[PDB]
Each structure stands twice: as structure tokens, then as C-alpha cells.
Design an enzyme around this catalytic site. Structure first.
Site, PDB file in Angstrom:
ATOM      1  N   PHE A  79       0.835  -1.237   0.000  1.00 29.82           N
ATOM      2  CA  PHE A  79       0.000   0.000   0.000  1.00 29.82           C
ATOM      3  C   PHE A  79       0.849   1.258   0.000  1.00 29.82           C
ATOM      4  CE2 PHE A  79      -2.846   3.036   2.340  1.00 29.82           C
ATOM      5  CZ  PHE A  79      -3.850   3.069   1.439  1.00 29.82           C
ATOM      6  N   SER A 154       3.927  -5.969   3.904  1.00 33.42           N
ATOM      7  CA  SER A 154       2.565  -5.480   4.157  1.00 33.42           C
ATOM      8  C   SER A 154       1.652  -6.099   3.132  1.00 33.42           C
ATOM      9  CB  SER A 154       2.463  -3.920   4.150  1.00 33.42           C
ATOM     10  OG  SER A 154       1.114  -3.389   4.308  1.00 33.42           O
ATOM     11  N   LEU A 155       1.043  -5.286   2.309  1.00 39.27           N
ATOM     12  CA  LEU A 155       0.136  -5.837   1.336  1.00 39.27           C
ATOM     13  C   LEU A 155       0.916  -6.742   0.428  1.00 39.27           C
ATOM     14  CD1 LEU A 155      -2.613  -4.591   1.929  1.00 39.27           C
ATOM     15  CD2 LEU A 155      -2.191  -3.147  -0.043  1.00 39.27           C
ATOM     16  N   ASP A 178       6.141  -8.162   7.696  1.00 40.18           N
ATOM     17  CA  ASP A 178       4.923  -7.712   8.392  1.00 40.18           C
ATOM     18  C   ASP A 178       3.659  -7.658   7.537  1.00 40.18           C
ATOM     19  OD1 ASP A 178       3.872  -6.940  11.055  1.00 40.18           O
ATOM     20  OD2 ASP A 178       3.605  -4.946  10.125  1.00 40.18           O
ATOM     21  N   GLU A 189      -7.562 -18.714   3.580  1.00 37.01           N
ATOM     22  CA  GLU A 189      -6.169 -18.740   3.257  1.00 37.01           C
ATOM     23  C   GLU A 189      -6.108 -18.422   1.789  1.00 37.01           C
ATOM     24  OE1 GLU A 189      -5.808 -22.948   4.772  1.00 37.01           O
ATOM     25  OE2 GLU A 189      -4.384 -22.103   6.159  1.00 37.01           O
ATOM     26  N   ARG A 192      -5.281 -14.564   1.892  1.00 44.68           N
ATOM     27  CA  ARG A 192      -4.168 -14.121   2.624  1.00 44.68           C
ATOM     28  C   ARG A 192      -2.893 -14.896   2.232  1.00 44.68           C
ATOM     29  NH1 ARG A 192      -3.149 -17.385   6.684  1.00 44.68           N
ATOM     30  NH2 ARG A 192      -4.635 -18.469   8.022  1.00 44.68           N
ATOM     31  N   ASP A 194      -0.291 -17.967   3.937  1.00 41.97           N
ATOM     32  CA  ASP A 194      -0.240 -19.025   4.918  1.00 41.97           C
ATOM     33  C   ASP A 194       0.793 -19.961   4.418  1.00 41.97           C
ATOM     34  OD1 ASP A 194      -2.396 -20.046   2.758  1.00 41.97           O
ATOM     35  OD2 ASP A 194      -1.910 -21.870   3.933  1.00 41.97           O
ATOM     36  N   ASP A 197       1.436 -21.500   0.727  1.00 45.15           N
ATOM     37  CA  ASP A 197       1.580 -20.787  -0.532  1.00 45.15           C
ATOM     38  C   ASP A 197       2.979 -21.005  -1.093  1.00 45.15           C
ATOM     39  OD1 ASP A 197      -1.192 -19.626  -0.361  1.00 45.15           O
ATOM     40  OD2 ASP A 197      -0.415 -18.222   1.050  1.00 45.15           O
ATOM     41  N   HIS A 261       5.676  -0.769  11.388  1.00 45.78           N
ATOM     42  CA  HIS A 261       5.301  -1.563  10.168  1.00 45.78           C
ATOM     43  C   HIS A 261       6.500  -1.740   9.215  1.00 45.78           C
ATOM     44  CE1 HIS A 261       2.275  -3.304   7.619  1.00 45.78           C
ATOM     45  NE2 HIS A 261       2.264  -2.340   6.715  1.00 45.78           N
TER      46      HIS A 261
HETATM   47  C1  LIG Z   1      -2.080  -1.830   6.054  1.00 49.54           C
HETATM   48  C2  LIG Z   1      -1.649  -0.545   5.382  1.00 49.54           C
HETATM   49  C3  LIG Z   1      -0.207  -0.124   5.687  1.00 49.54           C
HETATM   50  C4  LIG Z   1      -0.123   1.389   5.733  1.00 49.54           C
HETATM   51  C5  LIG Z   1       1.299   1.868   5.783  1.00 49.54           C
HETATM   52  C6  LIG Z   1       1.639   2.741   4.608  1.00 49.54           C
HETATM   53  C7  LIG Z   1       3.125   3.038   4.715  1.00 49.54           C
HETATM   54  C8  LIG Z   1       3.588   3.906   3.554  1.00 49.54           C
HETATM   55  C9  LIG Z   1       4.720   3.294   2.738  1.00 49.54           C
HETATM   56  C10 LIG Z   1       6.046   3.914   3.197  1.00 49.54           C
HETATM   57  N1  LIG Z   1       6.865   4.617   2.164  1.00 49.54           N
HETATM   58  C11 LIG Z   1       6.053   5.220   1.065  1.00 49.54           C
HETATM   59  C12 LIG Z   1       7.739   5.687   2.767  1.00 49.54           C
HETATM   60  O1  LIG Z   1       7.601   3.699   1.728  1.00 49.54           O
HETATM   61 CA   LIG Z   2      -2.887 -18.405   0.966  1.00 57.07          CA
END
Ligand SMILES: CCCCCCCCCC[N+](C)(C)[O-]
Ligand SMILES: [Ca+2]
Ligand SMILES: CCCCCCCCCC[N+](C)(C)[O-]
Ligand SMILES: [Ca+2]
Length: 448
Positions: A79, A154-155, A178, A189, A192, A194, A197, A261
Site C-alpha cells: 500500500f 505489508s500488502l 509484516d 487462506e 491471505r 499461509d 503458498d 510496520h
Molecule cells: C495496512 C496498510 C499499511 C499502511 C502503511 C503505509 C506506509 C507507507 C509506505 C512507506 N513509504 C512510502 C515511505 O515507503
Molecule cells: Ca494463501
């Protein structure tokens, strides 16, 4: 209410992709074109500029430095992040200083600039773009899928788990930096990430506080053969706790609200160059770890958290195998863990701090309060501690100690023994300080 696309197939907007407790509204992915997924190829041959490759025009690959002989690392952002010049590319480069290999950064910036809810769907596309590109390293150059490592943040983590599932778990490793919580924690699953995969899934959890009422963007849920929890995985050192650069709405907000994060890809990227830097220890809970438990490294060794996790003998003996450890506050974030015992001596009962320093070989540590409390003669008092740097071999401590209750005598206390120890192996070093000088000294206990 699905929609199909190019060679990527179809996307059913119905459960579990949407209309879940986790994804209450029904939407559908953007278009491949709208997402603008872009595979950028780095190899030891070209460690600076990349080669735009495409699974659509096989010519672009074959005419590229891609080496069917070597492992291939994929690095997917999440994201509101990018591939071109953010950390993913930075991470590819680091990988090529240590192994000879193919590293691709999956840039889907434009698609990850959408609204979170949408973004959570675009991920399905990039999954397929990626999966597809892999389905055509196999068909075209007989490139074995089990030579592919996908690393997603993340995503991105879930993205990678998606590709992985499209290839029936044929892909050798996906690493989740993360993995995002919103829309994924406690979901099929299918949607997401798990352990199914990939042949091997390893996860780093840095922001696993509850997303709701509380904003921990990370998943607390174990989703790997190995789930690592640095610093317990909820509050990372170096961060103070809790997109269009919010920094233009509220100065400092982004960094503030995303720092934990992000430590997931920080720690990982540093493990690439510093394998011995992040040894995880197995344990039931972080507290047991923090309360001087699960020490030192077990029979065969501690897994190296990070890049060299795939060297652990029992990496897939189970799922949700959990490990704990503590990072540094900054730089390369490497810390090493040592155990420190101190059994007391003397006559009179005091109160106080029980500090300590270290010379090791390389440098010298910091002060290390091992105990505050009642200091009765010949008892004992240990505490595990974290050395934000690589020293060597102790046998060169310093002690020191201070007052809490002011008087009852002022006794001649010292310290009979100070069992040191390493985490890595078990190398004790312990010393005798025969000569119990009273208070506030650098009584340097020494080998025996
Ligand atoms: C679950 C959604 C996570 C939201 C965190 C968004 C972090 C922005 C990405 C960081 N950056 C653009 C500086 O790399
Ligand atoms: Ca999966
Ligand atoms: C006090 C210095 C650190 C920055 C703290 C910024 C917190 C603002 C929270 C962001 N938000 C949009 C929720 O206001
Ligand atoms: Ca490796």
C-alpha cells in the site's frame, strides 16, 4: 460478479474475495493496465539500472541478463509504496553483494496508490502478473519454481502469498515482511498468506498490535512455517508508537504511524548483509523470553531471522513455529544476546543498581543494570541482555553499583562470581573477584 483479464484469468467478486467479515463491501480489482505492474530486473551483471522485462513478450527476458542457472528473488512492496527507487530496489542490490542471482523488484505503485479497500483487490492482479511471469520461466526456460523466493512487505506479503497459491505451492519460498492485518487477519487462506503458498514461508512481525481500536497494521496471526517476533513484534525500538504523505496534512504523521510496520523490511534488509545479526530463539511467549527463558541458542543453532532463515534444519518441521529476539534501536539493528549472572557476597544488607560494562575485543559496551533490589550475601542474580554490536570474547568486565536506601552500615560487598554467557553457542567466561571492595568501584573480576 466477476471480470476477466488478458492471460491472468478471472476475478470473482464473491466470497472470500469480498462480502466477508474481513472485506464487508463488494469491489473488484482494477485493470492490469490501471495497476501498471512492472517487473524490474537486477542481476550481478547489472547491479544499478534494471531491465524492464515482461511475461507478455518473452523476447524481453531471453534478451536479458536473467540467469536460469541461479535463484531468483522477487521483492514486492505494499500500500502506497513503490518499486522504482524505494527500498525494494535498494534490497535487490544488497542481495547481489552476497550471492550471484536474479533479483526482481515488483513495482505496482500506481495500483497501490488506490484506496486501501481497492488496493486490497489490486493485489490479486499483481499476484497473477507475478505468478504468470513465473509460469513462463518454467515453460520457456525450464526454470524450476522451487528456485524462486518471493519477499513481500505489508500488502506485498499477501501479494506474494497470492502468486504462491496460483502455483500450487511449487514456489520455494515466500517471506512475509509484516503482512498487513486489515482484510486479512482471520480470513480464508485463499486471500491471505499461509504456509501452503510456498514450500517455505517465513514471517517477520513488527507491528502486530491490533489494527482496530489501536492501529497495529501488522498481523498477529502466525502464517508461516516460521513466525519471528522481534522485540515481541508489537513495539519496535527506535520508534515512538501509534499516505498521500500525510506529512502534508500533519507534519510527522506518516513516519510516526508507519515506523514499526516498516521495521520489518529494515531488519530483513540488514540481515541480508548481517546474517548473524538476528538470531531467533524458540519460545512460547515473548515474556518467557524476556524473563531470561529459552536461552541460549538450542542444539543445532538459532535460526538466522531474515535472509538466511532458509538454512534452518527444521525450517518446515512444523507450522507457526515461533521465535523471539531483540533488535537494535538503529543503523543495522544487530544485537547479540548474552546471559549475565551475579552471585553476591559480603556481610551487610544494602540496596541498589548492579551495573556492568564490557571490553570484549572489538570495542566496549554500555552500562548494564543487571539488578536493582536487596543485596543479601551469597545468593545470585542473573539477567539476559542485548549487545547492539559485535564485540568478541568478554573476560574483561567492569561492575559499579549505586545506592537506593541510604544507610544501615555501608558494607564490603563485591561479587563472588559473575557467570557471563553467549547466546549463539554457550561460551560461558565467568570470573572470581576475590577482594570485595565496598561501593562504587570498577572491581574488574577476571578469568577462572
Ligand atoms: C495496512 C496498510 C499499511 C499502511 C502503511 C503505509 C506506509 C507507507 C509506505 C512507506 N513509504 C512510502 C515511505 O515507503
Ligand atoms: Ca494463501
Ligand atoms: C510529536 C511528534 C511525532 C508526530 C506525531 C504525529 C501524530 C499525528 C497522528 C496522525 N493523524 C492523522 C492521526 O493525526
Ligand atoms: Ca539464502
Amino acid at each position: 460478479k466477476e471480470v476477466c483479464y488478458t492471460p491472468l484469468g478471472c476475478f470473482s467478486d464473491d466470497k472470500p474475495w469480498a462480502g466477508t467479515l474481513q472485506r464487508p463491501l463488494k469491489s473488484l480489482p482494477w485493470s492490469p493496465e490501471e495497476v501498471n505492474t512492472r517487473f524490474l530486473l537486477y542481476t550481478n551483471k547489472n547491479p544499478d539500472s534494471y531491465q524492464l522485462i515482461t511475461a507478455r513478450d518473452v523476447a524481453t527476458i531471453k534478451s536479458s541478463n536473467f540467469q536460469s542457472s541461479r535463484k531468483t528473488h522477487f521483492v514486492i512492496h505494499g500500500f502506497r509504496d513503490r518499486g522504482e527507487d524505494s527500498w525494494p530496489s535498494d534490497m535487490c542490490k544488497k542481495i547481489l553483494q552476497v550471492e550471484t542471482t536474479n533479483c526482481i523488484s515488483v513495482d505496482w505503485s500506481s495500483g497501490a496508490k488506490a484506496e486501501y479497500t481497492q488496493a486490497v483487490q489490486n493485489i490479486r492482479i499483481v499476484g497473477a502478473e507475478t505468478a504468470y511471469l513465473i509460469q513462463q520461466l518454467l515453460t520457456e526456460l525450464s526454470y524450476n519454481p522451487e528456485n524462486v523466493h518471493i519477499i513481500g512487505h505489508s500488502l506485498g506479503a499477501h501479494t506474494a502469498g497470492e502468486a504462491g497459491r496460483r502455483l500450487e505451492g511449487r514456489v520455494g519460498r515466500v517471506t512475509g515482511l509484516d503482512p498487513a492485518e486489515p482484510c486479512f487477519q482471520d480470513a480464508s487462506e485463499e486471500v491471505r498468506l499461509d504456509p501452503s503458498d510456498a514450500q517455505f514461508v517465513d514471517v517477520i512481525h513488527t507491528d502486530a498490535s491490533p489494527m482496530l481500536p489501536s492501529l497495529g497494521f501488522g498481523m498477529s496471526q502466525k502464517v508461516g512455517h516460521m513466525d519471528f517476533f522481534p522485540n515481541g513484534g508489537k513495539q519496535m525500538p527506535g520508534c515512538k508508537r501509534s499516505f498521500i504523505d500525510i506529512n502534508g496534512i500533519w507534519q510527522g504523521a506518516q513516519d510516526y504511524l508507519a515506523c514499526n510496520h516498516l521495521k520489518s523490511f529494515e531488519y530483513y534488509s540488514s540481515s541480508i548483509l548481517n546474517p548473524d545479526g538476528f538470531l531467533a530463539y524458540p519460545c512460547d511467549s515473548y515474556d518467557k523470553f524476556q524473563e531470561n527463558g529459552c536461552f541460549p541458542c538450542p542444539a543445532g543453532g538459532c535460526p538466522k531471522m531474515g535472509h538466511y532463515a532458509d538454512q534452518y534444519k527444521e525450517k518446515t518441521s512444523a507450522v507457526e513455529q515461533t521465535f523471539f529476539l531483540n533488535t537494535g534501536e538503529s543503523g543495522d539493528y544487530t544485537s547479540w544476546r548474552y546471559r549475565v549472572s551475579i552471585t553476591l557476597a559480603g556481610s551487610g544488607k544494602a540496596n541498589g543498581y548492579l551495573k556492568v560494562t564490557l571490553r570484549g575485543s572489538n570495542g566496549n559496551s554500555k552500562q548494564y543494570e543487571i539488578f536493582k533490589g536487596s543485596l543479601q550475601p551469597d545468593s545470585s542474580y542473573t539477567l539476559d541482555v542485548d549487545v547492539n554490536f559485535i564485540i568478541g570474547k568478554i573476560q574483561e568486565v567492569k561492575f559499579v553499583w549505586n545506592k537506593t536506601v541510604l544507610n544501615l552500615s555501608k558494607p564490603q560487598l563485591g561479587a563472588s562470581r559473575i557467570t557471563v554467557q553467549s547466546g549463539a553457542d554457550g561460551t560461558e567466561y565467568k570470573f572470581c573477584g576475590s577482594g570485595t571492595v565496598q561501593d562504587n568501584v570498577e572491581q574488574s573480576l577476571y578469568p577462572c
